Amino acid sequence: GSPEFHMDALGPLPDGWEKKIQSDNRVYFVNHKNRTTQWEDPRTQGQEVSLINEGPLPPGWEIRYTAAGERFFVDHNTRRTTFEDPRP
């Protein structure tokens, strides 16, 4: 009797951030602790450094998972999805 909710409730609201996806595939973020909004993924706004300091996944990029269970990368600069590219 598994609930049709909280399937992957690790991503949405982990500690402060709140991620809501837009039909463009742009996730909005709202961190309520520090009060900040971020487009696509929180690439430390312009600085693009905080999630670069130990982040081999979220440099304002997105993992896009296909139903088969494959995660790709997504960059908003060129509007690209790709197997890898930013960091292994």
JSON list of C-alpha atoms in Angstrom, two decimals:
[
{"chain": "A", "resi": 1, "resn": "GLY", "atom": "CA", "xyz": [0.00, 0.00, 0.00]},
{"chain": "A", "resi": 2, "resn": "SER", "atom": "CA", "xyz": [2.59, 2.54, -1.09]},
{"chain": "A", "resi": 3, "resn": "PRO", "atom": "CA", "xyz": [1.31, 6.16, -1.21]},
{"chain": "A", "resi": 4, "resn": "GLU", "atom": "CA", "xyz": [1.22, 7.89, -4.60]},
{"chain": "A", "resi": 5, "resn": "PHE", "atom": "CA", "xyz": [3.40, 10.61, -3.09]},
{"chain": "A", "resi": 6, "resn": "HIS", "atom": "CA", "xyz": [6.84, 11.02, -1.47]},
{"chain": "A", "resi": 7, "resn": "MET", "atom": "CA", "xyz": [8.32, 8.73, -4.15]},
{"chain": "A", "resi": 8, "resn": "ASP", "atom": "CA", "xyz": [11.45, 10.83, -4.54]},
{"chain": "A", "resi": 9, "resn": "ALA", "atom": "CA", "xyz": [10.76, 13.43, -1.87]},
{"chain": "A", "resi": 10, "resn": "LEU", "atom": "CA", "xyz": [14.49, 13.81, -1.27]},
{"chain": "A", "resi": 11, "resn": "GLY", "atom": "CA", "xyz": [14.92, 16.42, -3.97]},
{"chain": "A", "resi": 12, "resn": "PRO", "atom": "CA", "xyz": [12.02, 18.80, -3.16]},
{"chain": "A", "resi": 13, "resn": "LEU", "atom": "CA", "xyz": [12.76, 20.72, 0.05]},
{"chain": "A", "resi": 14, "resn": "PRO", "atom": "CA", "xyz": [15.87, 18.83, 1.32]},
{"chain": "A", "resi": 15, "resn": "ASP", "atom": "CA", "xyz": [16.78, 21.48, 3.89]},
{"chain": "A", "resi": 16, "resn": "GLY", "atom": "CA", "xyz": [16.13, 24.95, 2.51]},
{"chain": "A", "resi": 17, "resn": "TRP", "atom": "CA", "xyz": [15.83, 24.81, -1.25]},
{"chain": "A", "resi": 18, "resn": "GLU", "atom": "CA", "xyz": [12.50, 24.30, -2.95]},
{"chain": "A", "resi": 19, "resn": "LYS", "atom": "CA", "xyz": [12.47, 23.18, -6.57]},
{"chain": "A", "resi": 20, "resn": "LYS", "atom": "CA", "xyz": [9.50, 23.60, -8.92]},
{"chain": "A", "resi": 21, "resn": "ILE", "atom": "CA", "xyz": [9.78, 22.56, -12.58]},
{"chain": "A", "resi": 22, "resn": "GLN", "atom": "CA", "xyz": [8.49, 24.73, -15.41]},
{"chain": "A", "resi": 23, "resn": "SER", "atom": "CA", "xyz": [7.24, 23.26, -18.72]},
{"chain": "A", "resi": 24, "resn": "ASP", "atom": "CA", "xyz": [10.42, 24.58, -20.38]},
{"chain": "A", "resi": 25, "resn": "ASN", "atom": "CA", "xyz": [12.28, 22.13, -18.10]},
{"chain": "A", "resi": 26, "resn": "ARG", "atom": "CA", "xyz": [13.54, 25.03, -16.04]},
{"chain": "A", "resi": 27, "resn": "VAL", "atom": "CA", "xyz": [13.44, 24.33, -12.33]},
{"chain": "A", "resi": 28, "resn": "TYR", "atom": "CA", "xyz": [12.86, 27.31, -10.10]},
{"chain": "A", "resi": 29, "resn": "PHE", "atom": "CA", "xyz": [14.42, 27.24, -6.67]},
{"chain": "A", "resi": 30, "resn": "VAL", "atom": "CA", "xyz": [13.57, 28.98, -3.50]},
{"chain": "A", "resi": 31, "resn": "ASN", "atom": "CA", "xyz": [15.84, 28.59, -0.51]},
{"chain": "A", "resi": 32, "resn": "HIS", "atom": "CA", "xyz": [13.95, 29.90, 2.50]},
{"chain": "A", "resi": 33, "resn": "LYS", "atom": "CA", "xyz": [16.83, 29.81, 4.98]},
{"chain": "A", "resi": 34, "resn": "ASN", "atom": "CA", "xyz": [18.94, 32.31, 3.06]},
{"chain": "A", "resi": 35, "resn": "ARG", "atom": "CA", "xyz": [16.05, 33.61, 0.95]},
{"chain": "A", "resi": 36, "resn": "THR", "atom": "CA", "xyz": [17.10, 33.19, -2.66]},
{"chain": "A", "resi": 37, "resn": "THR", "atom": "CA", "xyz": [15.58, 32.23, -6.01]},
{"chain": "A", "resi": 38, "resn": "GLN", "atom": "CA", "xyz": [17.51, 30.45, -8.79]},
{"chain": "A", "resi": 39, "resn": "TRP", "atom": "CA", "xyz": [16.67, 29.43, -12.37]},
{"chain": "A", "resi": 40, "resn": "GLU", "atom": "CA", "xyz": [17.23, 25.91, -13.81]},
{"chain": "A", "resi": 41, "resn": "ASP", "atom": "CA", "xyz": [19.49, 24.94, -10.87]},
{"chain": "A", "resi": 42, "resn": "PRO", "atom": "CA", "xyz": [21.20, 27.13, -8.16]},
{"chain": "A", "resi": 43, "resn": "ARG", "atom": "CA", "xyz": [24.52, 27.77, -9.93]},
{"chain": "A", "resi": 44, "resn": "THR", "atom": "CA", "xyz": [25.47, 30.31, -7.24]},
{"chain": "A", "resi": 45, "resn": "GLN", "atom": "CA", "xyz": [23.74, 32.96, -9.38]},
{"chain": "A", "resi": 46, "resn": "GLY", "atom": "CA", "xyz": [26.34, 34.89, -11.37]},
{"chain": "A", "resi": 47, "resn": "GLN", "atom": "CA", "xyz": [29.31, 33.73, -9.28]},
{"chain": "A", "resi": 48, "resn": "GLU", "atom": "CA", "xyz": [28.68, 30.08, -10.17]},
{"chain": "A", "resi": 49, "resn": "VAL", "atom": "CA", "xyz": [31.08, 28.81, -7.50]},
{"chain": "A", "resi": 50, "resn": "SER", "atom": "CA", "xyz": [29.36, 27.47, -4.39]},
{"chain": "A", "resi": 51, "resn": "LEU", "atom": "CA", "xyz": [27.99, 24.47, -6.28]},
{"chain": "A", "resi": 52, "resn": "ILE", "atom": "CA", "xyz": [31.33, 24.33, -8.09]},
{"chain": "A", "resi": 53, "resn": "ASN", "atom": "CA", "xyz": [33.37, 23.94, -4.90]},
{"chain": "A", "resi": 54, "resn": "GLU", "atom": "CA", "xyz": [32.37, 20.31, -4.39]},
{"chain": "A", "resi": 55, "resn": "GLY", "atom": "CA", "xyz": [29.72, 19.88, -7.04]},
{"chain": "A", "resi": 56, "resn": "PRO", "atom": "CA", "xyz": [30.51, 17.40, -9.84]},
{"chain": "A", "resi": 57, "resn": "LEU", "atom": "CA", "xyz": [26.80, 17.40, -10.70]},
{"chain": "A", "resi": 58, "resn": "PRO", "atom": "CA", "xyz": [24.91, 20.69, -9.91]},
{"chain": "A", "resi": 59, "resn": "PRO", "atom": "CA", "xyz": [26.93, 23.65, -11.40]},
{"chain": "A", "resi": 60, "resn": "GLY", "atom": "CA", "xyz": [23.59, 25.07, -12.45]},
{"chain": "A", "resi": 61, "resn": "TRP", "atom": "CA", "xyz": [23.15, 22.00, -14.58]},
{"chain": "A", "resi": 62, "resn": "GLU", "atom": "CA", "xyz": [20.42, 19.43, -14.31]},
{"chain": "A", "resi": 63, "resn": "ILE", "atom": "CA", "xyz": [20.38, 15.68, -14.35]},
{"chain": "A", "resi": 64, "resn": "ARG", "atom": "CA", "xyz": [17.61, 14.69, -16.70]},
{"chain": "A", "resi": 65, "resn": "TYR", "atom": "CA", "xyz": [16.38, 11.17, -16.05]},
{"chain": "A", "resi": 66, "resn": "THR", "atom": "CA", "xyz": [14.62, 9.19, -18.74]},
{"chain": "A", "resi": 67, "resn": "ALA", "atom": "CA", "xyz": [12.00, 6.61, -17.74]},
{"chain": "A", "resi": 68, "resn": "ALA", "atom": "CA", "xyz": [14.52, 3.81, -18.49]},
{"chain": "A", "resi": 69, "resn": "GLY", "atom": "CA", "xyz": [16.45, 5.21, -15.54]},
{"chain": "A", "resi": 70, "resn": "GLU", "atom": "CA", "xyz": [19.23, 7.03, -17.36]},
{"chain": "A", "resi": 71, "resn": "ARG", "atom": "CA", "xyz": [20.45, 10.37, -16.05]},
{"chain": "A", "resi": 72, "resn": "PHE", "atom": "CA", "xyz": [21.79, 12.89, -18.55]},
{"chain": "A", "resi": 73, "resn": "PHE", "atom": "CA", "xyz": [23.13, 16.42, -18.15]},
{"chain": "A", "resi": 74, "resn": "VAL", "atom": "CA", "xyz": [21.30, 19.62, -19.05]},
{"chain": "A", "resi": 75, "resn": "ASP", "atom": "CA", "xyz": [22.86, 23.07, -19.46]},
{"chain": "A", "resi": 76, "resn": "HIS", "atom": "CA", "xyz": [20.80, 26.25, -19.86]},
{"chain": "A", "resi": 77, "resn": "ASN", "atom": "CA", "xyz": [23.59, 28.22, -21.56]},
{"chain": "A", "resi": 78, "resn": "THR", "atom": "CA", "xyz": [23.30, 26.35, -24.83]},
{"chain": "A", "resi": 79, "resn": "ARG", "atom": "CA", "xyz": [20.00, 24.63, -23.96]},
{"chain": "A", "resi": 80, "resn": "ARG", "atom": "CA", "xyz": [21.51, 21.17, -24.25]},
{"chain": "A", "resi": 81, "resn": "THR", "atom": "CA", "xyz": [20.98, 17.73, -22.85]},
{"chain": "A", "resi": 82, "resn": "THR", "atom": "CA", "xyz": [23.92, 15.34, -23.03]},
{"chain": "A", "resi": 83, "resn": "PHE", "atom": "CA", "xyz": [25.33, 12.13, -21.55]},
{"chain": "A", "resi": 84, "resn": "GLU", "atom": "CA", "xyz": [28.18, 13.98, -19.82]},
{"chain": "A", "resi": 85, "resn": "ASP", "atom": "CA", "xyz": [30.16, 17.18, -20.77]},
{"chain": "A", "resi": 86, "resn": "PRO", "atom": "CA", "xyz": [30.51, 19.39, -17.59]},
{"chain": "A", "resi": 87, "resn": "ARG", "atom": "CA", "xyz": [32.20, 17.08, -15.08]},
{"chain": "A", "resi": 88, "resn": "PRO", "atom": "CA", "xyz": [32.65, 13.28, -14.81]}
]
